[PDB]
Structure formats: structure tokens, C-alpha cells
């Protein structure tokens, strides 16, 4: 039951006998009435560009979104499992899901596997308690931030965010700031490129998903 450990010894033996086992800029910015998440759209299998238009913004729930780095399959699987749990909990409670609930589920699931599930996430959302932004580490640690960056291009994006962030930001200002950080990651990092995807979650409104906001 669950994830299998079969063929572990066989795979190790193959690795010992010369059998090669076969084998991003993300930002989140809070503003005065919501939160924005943005990402680059380049997908590479090593130095080769596999896809120039890749959707990296994933939906935990209609108003709770996330993006990830690290092992891609782990990120997708964990996001989908927590989305299923969140949907079931919302149906059970007859209430809108809270971002803190998704944070707790993700934290406990990642801590259970002791860092062997390589999922590093930025999770933004809006619920009846307000707007929330969180960063989640593979080993099970989480943090709260007003603006966060992730991926190989995270340092350039963080520099841009540190240059042009204020307490009181409008929706347009936050969208521009997030897009600028993603553009800096695109220009100055080899892992990031192509287009920018944005998602804006405002209190009291539907989530607005803008794919290819700047091409």
C-alpha cells in the first residue's frame, strides 16, 4: 500500500554495475486587498529547452494557488493530493477552504516523508479570513512572507522585489512588480525564459488567471 519500495535493491545493483538511471522563476506578492503569484514558462530537460510555453501555476482550490520547484513529479503529485483533501474537507464542512488548512496538510505530509519528497512550494490564496502567502520546504518547514521568490532565478527576482516593494500596493502596482521580478529572472538566469504567467486573487472576487501576461 502507498508508494512502493520494490526494486530498490535491484536499482542500486544496476547503479553499481554502470547502468545510468534516467533523470525557473516564481514570485508571490501581497497587496492591499489580495495576493499575486507569477512564474516563468520555460521547461528544460537539462540544457535543452523542452517547452517554451509551460504552465507552472497550479490550483489547489479555486482561490488557492501554488507554484513549485525541485522534483517536478513530486510537486505535481503533492499539489494534487492536497487539492483532493482540500476539496473533500470543504464538502464535509460546507465552507470555503482556508489557506492555513492547506498549509497544515502540506506541512504534515512533507514532514511524514522526512524530506524524501522533493517539493518546494509557494502557496498564495484568499479565504474568508483574508489573504495569505506561504513558502513550504521539502523537509516540512513553512514560513510566512509579504513577498517571496523561488527557483534558480530567485535571487534576481528578490533583488527586484527588494527594490520596489511597499506596504500599500494597488492591484496594478503588485501585478507590475511581480511581472518585473519574473522578467529579471528571465533575462539574468539561464533556467528562466519565454513568457510570464500571473494569477491575481482578490478578496471578494473570483481568481483571475492571466496566462502569457507578458510574452
Amino acid at each position: 500500500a502507498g508508494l512502493s519500495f520494490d526494486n530498490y535493491q535491484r536499482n542500486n545493483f544496476l547503479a553499481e554495475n554502470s547502468h545510468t538511471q534516467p533523470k525557473t522563476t516564481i514570485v508571490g506578492v501581497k497587496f492591499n486587498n489580495g495576493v499575486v503569484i507569477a512564474a516563468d514558462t520555460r521547461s528544460t530537460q537539462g540544457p535543452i529547452v523542452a517547452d517554451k510555453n509551460c504552465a507552472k501555476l497550479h490550483r489547489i482550490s479555486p482561490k488557492i494557488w501554488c507554484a513549485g520547484a525541485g522534483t517536478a513529479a513530486d510537486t505535481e503529485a503533492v499539489t494534487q493530493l492536497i487539492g483532493s483533501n482540500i476539496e473533500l474537507h470543504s464538502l464535509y464542512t460546507s465552507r470555503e477552504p482556508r489557506v492555513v488548512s492547506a498549509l497544515q496538510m502540506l506541512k504534515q505530509h512533507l514532514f511524514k516523508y522526512q524530506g524524501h519528497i522533493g517539493a518546494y512550494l509557494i502557496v498564495a490564496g484568499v479565504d474568508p479570513t483574508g489573504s495569505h502567502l506561504f513558502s513550504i520546504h521539502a523537509h516540512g518547514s513553512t514560513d510566512v512572507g509579504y513577498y517571496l521568490s523561488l527557483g534558480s532565478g530567485s535571487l534576481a527576482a528578490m533583488a527586484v522585489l527588494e527594490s520596489h516593494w511597499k506596504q500599500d500596493l494597488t492591484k496594478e502596482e503588485a501585478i507590475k512588480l511581480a511581472s518585473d521580478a519574473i522578467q529579471a529572472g528571465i533575462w539574468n538566469d539561464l533556467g528562466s525564459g519565454s513568457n510570464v504567467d500571473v494569477c491575481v486573487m482578490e478578496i471578494g472576487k473570483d481568481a483571475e488567471y492571466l496566462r502569457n501576461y507578458t510574452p
Binding site: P22, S43, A73
Partner: protein, 189 residues
């Protein structure tokens, strides 16, 4: 008795797809079908046979329950979940899925990593040991919205050029897939 490795190439045409695999001429082919969905697997041969048997099992049960054939997107999701089940003991394979949806008629191709991460491509997918040289040949030769004859010629030329650049009993198997007719061809070099 040594049949490990190989190359599989998938391309999209106008309203058709092409999927081709290498062969040793002269019964071990790396392309299987479960109705109108085609799967080509490269890598460890034991894992290839095991995955083929498992997917035949699961698609037979799916058709018995649903009373209809499975579509390429649903099969892609199934392959992804099956590969992820063996998270810590994964098969040493690279799979590629090709097909045409029975209802919408849109062509579909995709590739996978060893633990089921999906790479859905609009132009072509290359799987194999090198995946760097034949990849460049396919990049130089591919053109979008080709007719089935043009697509067959393009993919066959890519395979032949890959075969010439690094043998003796080399062969190829090509599938040209349309919504109503599937043509299987052999290339003897």
C-alpha cells in the same frame, strides 16, 4: 538477447500522428497499442515488457467497465499515476504516448520521465539513449501541419539519418495514425 535501449520518435501532422521505433530486423518491438492509443517505451527491456503487460491489463479492465475505448489523455494520466506508484523503485524507462481523440479528432502526443512527469508536446517527442543527435535531426527536419505522406517521409528520413550517423541489421517500424485508418510500415534500410 541484448535488446536494452533503443529510440522512439513521435510527431504530429495535420490530422494525424506518426510514431516510430528502432528494430533489429532479423520479434521484440517497442510499440504497443490498446485500441487507438499507441505507446512506445525505451530503456530496460524487462521494464518495457512489464509495463506493456500492466497497461494491457488496466486498459482491458477499463474497457470492460466503461464499455468504450480509453482516450489518449486519460491513458496519459493513467501512465503517469502508474509510474508514480513506484516512487522509490522506479522502472528504467522512457515512455511516449501518441493517438487521436475519437470524439474531437485532435492529435495528441506526450512523453514521460521515469516517475511519471508529463511532457505534453505539440511538435515532436524523442526518447532514447542519446536523445541529442536524433533530437537535432528531428528539429532540423520537422515542419508543422504536414500531410500523412509528408509526415511519414519526414519521420522516416529522421530515422534513416540517425541510423547512418553511428548499423548492420538495423530496421525501423513506423505507424501513421489517422482517425479512421492506421498504417503500419517496416523500413529495412
Amino acid at each position: 538477447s541484448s535488446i536494452n535501449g533503443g529510440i522512439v520518435v513521435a510527431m504530429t501532422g495535420k490530422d494525424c500522428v506518426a510514431i516510430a521505433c528502432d528494430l533489429r530486423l532479423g520479434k521484440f518491438e517497442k510499440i504497443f497499442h490498446y485500441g487507438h492509443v499507441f505507446l512506445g517505451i525505451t530503456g530496460l527491456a524487462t521494464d518495457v515488457t512489464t509495463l506493456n503487460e500492466m497497461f494491457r491489463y488496466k486498459t482491458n479492465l477499463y474497457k470492460l467497465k466503461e464499455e468504450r475505448a480509453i482516450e489518449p489523455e486519460t491513458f496519459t494520466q493513467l501512465v503517469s499515476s502508474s509510474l508514480y506508484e513506484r516512487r522509490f523503485g522506479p522502472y528504467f524507462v522512457g515512455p511516449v504516448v501518441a493517438g487521436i481523440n475519437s470524439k474531437s479528432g485532435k492529435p495528441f502526443i506526450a512523453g514521460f520521465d521515469l516517475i511519471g512527469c508529463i511532457d505534453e508536446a505539440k511538435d515532436f517527442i524523442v526518447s532514447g539513449t542519446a536523445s541529442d543527435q536524433l533530437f537535432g535531426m528531428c528539429e532540423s527536419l520537422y515542419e508543422p501541419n504536414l500531410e500523412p505522406e509528408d509526415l511519414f517521409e519526414t519521420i522516416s528520413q529522421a530515422l534513416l539519418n540517425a541510423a547512418d550517423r553511428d548499423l548492420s541489421g538495423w530496421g525501423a517500424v513506423v505507424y501513421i495514425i489517422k482517425k479512421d485508418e492506421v498504417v503500419k510500415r517496416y523500413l529495412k534500410m
